[PDB]
Amino acid sequence: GIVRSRLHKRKITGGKTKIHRKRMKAELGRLPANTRLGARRVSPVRARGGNFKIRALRLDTGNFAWASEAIAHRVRLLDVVYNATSNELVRTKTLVKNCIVAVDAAPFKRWYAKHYGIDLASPKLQREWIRRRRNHRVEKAIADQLREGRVLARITSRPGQSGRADGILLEGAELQFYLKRLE
Amino acid sequence: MRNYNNFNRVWKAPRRPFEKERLDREMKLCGQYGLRCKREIWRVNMTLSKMRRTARLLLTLPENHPRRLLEGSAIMRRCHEYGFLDEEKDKLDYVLSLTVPDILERRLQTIVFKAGLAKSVHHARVLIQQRHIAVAKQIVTIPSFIVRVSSERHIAFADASPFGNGRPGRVKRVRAKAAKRH
Amino acid sequence: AKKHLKRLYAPKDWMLSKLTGVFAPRPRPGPHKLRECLPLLVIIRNRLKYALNAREGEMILRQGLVHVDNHPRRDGKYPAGFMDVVEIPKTGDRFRLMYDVKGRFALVSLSEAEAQIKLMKVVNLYTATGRVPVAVTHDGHRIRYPDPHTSIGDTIVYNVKEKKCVDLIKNRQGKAVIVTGGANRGRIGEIVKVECHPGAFNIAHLKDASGAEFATRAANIFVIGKDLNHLQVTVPKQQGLRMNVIQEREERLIAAEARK
RNA sequence: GAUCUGGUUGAUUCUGCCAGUAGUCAUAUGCUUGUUUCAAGGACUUAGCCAUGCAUGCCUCAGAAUCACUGCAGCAGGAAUCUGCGCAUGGCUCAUUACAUCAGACGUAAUCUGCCGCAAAAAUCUUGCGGUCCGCAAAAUUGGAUAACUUGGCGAAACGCCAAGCUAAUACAUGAACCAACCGGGUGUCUCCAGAGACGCCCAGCGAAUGAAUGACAAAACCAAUGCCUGCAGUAACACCCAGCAGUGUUGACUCAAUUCAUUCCGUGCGAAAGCCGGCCCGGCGUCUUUUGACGAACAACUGCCCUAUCAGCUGGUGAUGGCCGUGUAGUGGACUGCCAUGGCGUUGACGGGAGCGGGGGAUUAGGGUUCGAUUCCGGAGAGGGAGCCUGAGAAAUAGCUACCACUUCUACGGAGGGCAGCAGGCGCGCAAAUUGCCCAAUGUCAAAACAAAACGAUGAGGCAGCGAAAAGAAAUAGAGUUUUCAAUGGGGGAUAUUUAAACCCAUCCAAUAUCGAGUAACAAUUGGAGGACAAGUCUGGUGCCAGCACCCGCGGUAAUUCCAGCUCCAAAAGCGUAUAUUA
RNA sequence: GGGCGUCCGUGAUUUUUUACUGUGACUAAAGAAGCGUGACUAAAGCAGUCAUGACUGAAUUAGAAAGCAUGGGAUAACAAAGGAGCAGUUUUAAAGGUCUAUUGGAGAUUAUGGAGCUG
Ligand SMILES: NC[C@@H]1O[C@H](O[C@H]2[C@@H](O)[C@H](O[C@@H]3[C@@H](O)[C@H](N)C[C@H](N)[C@H]3O[C@H]3O[C@H](CO)[C@@H](O)[C@H](O)[C@H]3N)O[C@@H]2CO)[C@H](N)[C@@H](O)[C@@H]1O
Ligand SMILES: [Mg+2]
Ligand SMILES: [Mg+2]
Ligand SMILES: [Mg+2]
Ligand SMILES: [Mg+2]
Numbered sequence A: 001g002i003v004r005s006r007l008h009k010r011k012i013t014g015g016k017t018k019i020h021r022k023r024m025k026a027e028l029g030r031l032p033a034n035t036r037l038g039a040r041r042v043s044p045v046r047a048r049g050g051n052f053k054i055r056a057l058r059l060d061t062g063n064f065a066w067a068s069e070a071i072a073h074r075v076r077l078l079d080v081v082y083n084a085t086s087n088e089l090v091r092t093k094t095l096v097k098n099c100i101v102a103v104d105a106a107p108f109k110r111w112y113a114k115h116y117g118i119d120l121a122s123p124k125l126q127r128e129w130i131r132r133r134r135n136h137r138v139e140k141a142i143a144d145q146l147r148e149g150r151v152l153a154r155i156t157s158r159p160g161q162s163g164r165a166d167g168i169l170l171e172g173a174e175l176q177f178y179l180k181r182l183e
Numbered sequence B: 001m002r003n004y005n006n007f008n009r010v011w012k013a014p015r016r017p018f019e020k021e022r023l024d025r026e027m028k029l030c031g032q033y034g035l036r037c038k039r040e041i042w043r044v045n046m047t048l049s050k051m052r053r054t055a056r057l058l059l060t061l062p063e064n065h066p067r068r069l070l071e072g073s074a075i076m077r078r079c080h081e082y083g084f085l086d087e088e089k090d091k092l093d094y095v096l097s098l099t100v101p102d103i104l105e106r107r108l109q110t111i112v113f114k115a116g117l118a119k120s121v122h123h124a125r126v127l128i129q130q131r132h133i134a135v136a137k138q139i140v141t142i143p144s145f146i147v148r149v150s151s152e153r154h155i156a157f158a159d160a161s162p163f164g165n166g167r168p169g170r171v172k173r174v175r176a177k178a179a180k181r182h
Numbered sequence C: 001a002k003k004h005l006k007r008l009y010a011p012k013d014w015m016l017s018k019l020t021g022v023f024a025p026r027p028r029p030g031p032h033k034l035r036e037c038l039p040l041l042v043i044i045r046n047r048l049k050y051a052l053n054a055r056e057g058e059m060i061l062r063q064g065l066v067h068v069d070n071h072p073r074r075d076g077k078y079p080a081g082f083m084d085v086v087e088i089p090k091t092g093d094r095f096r097l098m099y100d101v102k103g104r105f106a107l108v109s110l111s112e113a114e115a116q117i118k119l120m121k122v123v124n125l126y127t128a129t130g131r132v133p134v135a136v137t138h139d140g141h142r143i144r145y146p147d148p149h150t151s152i153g154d155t156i157v158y159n160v161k162e163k164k165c166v167d168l169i170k171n172r173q174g175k176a177v178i179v180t181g182g183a184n185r186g187r188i189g190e191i192v193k194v195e196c197h198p199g200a201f202n203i204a205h206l207k208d209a210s211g212a213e214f215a216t217r218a219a220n221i222f223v224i225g226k227d228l229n230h231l232q233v234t235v236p237k238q239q240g241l242r243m244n245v246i247q248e249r250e251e252r253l254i255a256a257e258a259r260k
Numbered sequence D: 001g002a003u004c005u006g007g008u009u010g011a012u013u014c015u016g017c018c019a020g021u022a023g024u025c026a027u028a029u030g031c032u033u034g035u036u037u038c039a040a041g042g043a044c045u046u047a048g049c050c051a052u053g054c055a056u057g058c059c060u061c062a063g064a065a066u067c068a069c070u071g072c073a074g075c076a077g078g079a080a081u082c083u084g085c086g087c088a089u090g091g092c093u094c095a096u097u098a099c100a101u102c103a104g105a106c107g108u109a110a111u112c113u114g115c116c117g118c119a120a121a122a123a124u125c126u127u128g129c130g131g132u133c134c135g136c137a138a139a140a141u142u143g144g145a146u147a148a149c150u151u152g153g154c155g156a157a158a159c160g161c162c163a164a165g166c167u168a169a170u171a172c173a174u175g176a177a178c179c180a181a182c183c184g185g186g187u188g189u190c191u192c193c194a195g196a197g198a199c200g201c202c203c204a205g206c207g208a209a210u211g212a213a214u215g216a217c218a219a220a221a222c223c224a225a226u227g228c229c230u231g232c233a234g235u236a237a238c239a240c241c242c243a244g245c246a247g248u249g250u251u252g253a254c255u256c257a258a259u260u261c262a263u264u265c266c267g268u269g270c271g272a273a274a275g276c277c278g279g280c281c282c283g284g285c286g287u288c289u290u291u292u293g294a295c296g297a298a299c300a301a302c303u304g305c306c307c308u309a310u311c312a313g314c315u316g317g318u319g320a321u322g323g324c325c326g327u328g329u330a331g332u333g334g335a336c337u338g339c340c341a342u343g344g345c346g347u348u349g350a351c352g353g354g355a356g357c358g359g360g361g362g363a364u365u366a367g368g369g370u371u372c373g374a375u376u377c378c379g380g381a382g383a384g385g386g387a388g389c390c391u392g393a394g395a396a397a398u399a400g401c402u403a404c405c406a407c408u409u410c411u412a413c414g415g416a417g418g419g420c421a422g423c424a425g426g427c428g429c430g431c432a433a434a435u436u437g438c439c440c441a442a443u444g445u446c447a448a449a450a451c452a453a454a455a456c457g458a459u460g461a462g463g464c465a466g467c468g469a470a471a472a473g474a475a476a477u478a479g480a481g482u483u484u485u486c487a488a489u490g491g492g493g494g495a496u497a498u499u500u501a502a503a504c505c506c507a508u509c510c511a512a513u514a515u516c517g518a519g520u521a522a523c524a525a526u527u528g529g530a531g532g533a534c535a536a537g538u539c540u541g542g543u544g545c546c547a548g549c550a551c552c553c554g555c556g557g558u559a560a561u562u563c564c565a566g567c568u569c570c571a572a573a574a575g576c577g578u579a580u581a582u583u584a
Numbered sequence E: 001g002g003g004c005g006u007c008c009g010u011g012a013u014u015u016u017u018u019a020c021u022g023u024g025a026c027u028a029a030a031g032a033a034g035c036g037u038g039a040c041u042a043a044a045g046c047a048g049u050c051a052u053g054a055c056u057g058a059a060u061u062a063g064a065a066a067g068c069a070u071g072g073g074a075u076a077a078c079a080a081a082g083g084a085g086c087a088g089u090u091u092u093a094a095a096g097g098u099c100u101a102u103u104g105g106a107g108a109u110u111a112u113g114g115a116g117c118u119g
């Protein structure tokens, strides 16, 4: 079938390699997943050793991490914003690793009110908020799009391999990199 | 097909098949030792050639070398054991002086002629092959049996032979049947 | 997946004659390596003559009558290798697999107290789940809580009945080893100097009881005591001393002539 | 033993080839062959085609027996079928094939890994009874379906099929509270002090995903919180429960081993088999998960490799060399999509063409070499050509599947099948290669499996025998004596037997009370020669440059050392000519 | 309580390889070489030999290149240079100026000082 060998590749001299075996099963590749936005549908793939590799088709949600705060929240993917491979993969809204997506931002605001106590008053007994909040500060570009409603984020998992759409929120120079390329 | 039992060749034909000097020596050796064919001489050539070649390799090696103390005391041991060299000859240069009649004297066809158990050397080859000579109470039917030095004391007639202590042979026994029907 | 050995591709230390059949008993995976073991059909039939063929040989093993390290082994293809203890309760004999100085496997007879401990060399150390640091051994054992001074090159004394690591022997300069691979296999010597060479094979220089100096790779040495007198385990009848090939050839001719 | 010899001339020195010569586990052929031992044996030509039979299956005390099967007086044997492993090995063949295979040596920290070895294991609000969601209980006495079978059958058949009715589990599915821990995070009321404790709730298992933190190191002054002192002596750390219950993973090196917390795994993981025996509570097994050693798999490439220039440029749009995100993989990677760059290889022979598996090794060899390697061991590849798959830990499997191409068998014409480079054989092809044999006794492999007991696992692997002057060992065809006798013992016939799985063979034996046999020993040696090299006839008959011989030189023209023959010799001898390769 | 000298791992300091050659380390049997041994000899084979079991044997060696370690420094080799194209050491006190360890801990400020910077 699809193979991953160098039998069809030309030599560095430019010479053709003459083939004297059949294709092996141990050198196969398989058809790509092309994971998109949509309600979750997965198909497992029986890999070597009997292990299962879960193809992701049509994913809509994942655990996205806010790395300065070292937390994650299960949020819902909204749109696919920028892809470094092609602009055609943005238009069909394919989920790959490292593509830039927008996520829900509601569990992140709610966590930022429950932890640090800052909204965008009720437990007067526990002001361990004051034990934090002094040294720590929050980047302004995060807090703008956090209250705007959707946060740009980066996919850190391989969905056709794992069947998950986990990610990380863009911070720092990495957010300021991709904000220039969009607008 | 998957059989790993080994076999090699024990004789070699000479270069130059018609040398008038060589053909005269080998007819003397077939007569003085009672031999069937020239091939029995030619394995005694190759037996002695291999001794003459290893002992000439060991003299390239110095003394107090490991392959000359071992394996040079082995080739002097088998010359002393089979009667190829008497016990005075111990220097390893005497293996290079061995001749084909020095090996042919140690065949059981020759000792049975030399010990006195047979009138001629063609009497000895018959009596070996017709099961009359025992080396150590072991009937040996091979004329090319190389007799050791320690075996010379014990060559005698076989204990099952009619000439020894066994039953009488054929011409007496088929005559003893013909005198029985009458 | 190979399942067969040819008797020519079998190891030479087993000493199976080439003319008796095409095949040799391929030892299963298990404790010891295929190149470096002696499977129990060869011990029961070819070493010990308790069995005349392989059909009498599984009447012994499948019945549960041979114990390798206190546990009955019903496999004729079980890999028994170095430092293993083979007991038989019915015939009342127990043996230890050691290398003799010519490199071959040798069955050293044992007492009851010497047959409880075996000596095992660490091959890997890692941390398992929990935070339990286990020690991987050449015989395939995974001791879970070893002596905290265990490093990789060391030797653990084990006591296979009560599965408790009773002792440790570190690998240092002042120790005595047995060589379990290479040309020098079966020889016993003090350690002289260990040449490190990181990224490649450690070389270990060794001196024998007579004073013969010889070297191996340090993955081939197996430390068995604090010195050559205080060995933790009993060794075969030459005790790691390799005689000259000339002198040992003279002695057999002298012994054969003096016997007659 | 680092050796040569005939042939150019009227003779002579050379150059130089032809010819002799001795090997080949190198084949074929011719003529011969009495005994034994050891053996190769359809590789070469056609990886051409194949009739028939057979070559891979497994049951113990220990998964499932209501045969409408068998004895016995419910206990035992059990056909059959579910189930669990195996069929990816072995065996054949050598067609492919030159930055490939392969060898020695490394790498996998780039990865998968059943069986086997030593280990690990604290997740899960389930049952029973009563009441309508609660109560009291506890050795959890769980649920539905299929085979075999019966019934009715379809079909010419097919290692083809249908429907209904039964019934198992170690098949499938479900599911275990409390006994029963430590440890941690997030968090709301309550006794205290000027932050501390108790209680409550959500979450806290192995594995997996993503994110964050560990995964070490290489002189005093003043204010706040805090530590012991009665201002600082001396000091692991820590607000009690445990006053040392990890401040310490490994490597040459890790983003790894492992741990902490954040989020959530929706079937694509996690039973104490809701398991089976046995002993008189305990002992043998059998199984999920997790983890690592082992037996392996897959990839990568350090050095090496026949001839060819009447093959000098090769590669790059449609990946060629590299780079960036991904994708795909078991994983690394132009392996692959997008984009960018303009590279990479070559007279140190690229590129293309021809020869053909690669080593271990064989033949010959003073030394240097020159050759052969289809073939037993190791590796690679293939199963009529070419694909593509399923299942599984492992196959791009072929005594597995699907399709096409080329051949191809049965048909009741509707249809159904084939794959001997497995072992015997068959036809072709050729110069050229055996028995449609007996057996698991040994060597092993598989596996639910020791042997035995009503009661023998399968094996064309592999042995064994038949054919078998491939090649190798050992060896008869006579001895002894005064025309004429005396002794021998095989070939060969046979056994109280012995071998052998059974025979065969060889070995032993012709009385142990008691066993057949040499004479022309007719029981009969041949194959090539006799000018030279090259050992051995100036013999006799025939033919008359004829017929023929002669490797080469030459013989033969009516007295032939050479032809055709008889004699007699020589050489090797159960062998010996010839032809073609190949080494000296 | 100082000196001496090792071991292990880590930092800072200015650099010499290659061929060759001597020793090692690793490297499947079958095959080759051969040590024992009267399978009746031999081709073989790894066995067997001896007076309610004894000494057991299966020794050893060559095996292409490349790979690994180490010491010897003749001969050669790679590389660079082309000689204006060039590479002052210590005592002593003084000036200016730069970004860790202790004070019981930890946090935050804070001057002094060590050693280095240049005129
Ligand atoms: N040359 C091999 C590679 O083929 C690739 O491209 C190839 C494909 O685009 C295409 O190959 C197709 C293949 O896609 C498709 N799945 C199957 C088809 N048989 C192939 O076709 C090719 O093979 C057959 C037989 O040889 C020929 O008859 C056909 O003309 C040829 N184009 O044709 C090209 C080969 O000629 C890339 N160009 C490159 O990686 C490389 O050239
Ligand atoms: Mg007799
Ligand atoms: Mg089944
Ligand atoms: Mg070749
Ligand atoms: Mg990449």
Ligand SMILES: [Mg+2]
Residues within 6 Å of the ligand: none
């Ligand atoms: Mg093979």
Ligand SMILES: [Mg+2]
Residues within 6 Å of the ligand: D385, D405
């Ligand atoms: Mg075709």
Ligand SMILES: [Mg+2]
Residues within 6 Å of the ligand: D420
């Ligand atoms: Mg056939």
Ligand SMILES: [Mg+2]
Residues within 6 Å of the ligand: D560
């Ligand atoms: Mg005449």
Ligand SMILES: [Mg+2]
Residues within 6 Å of the ligand: none
């Ligand atoms: Mg004539």
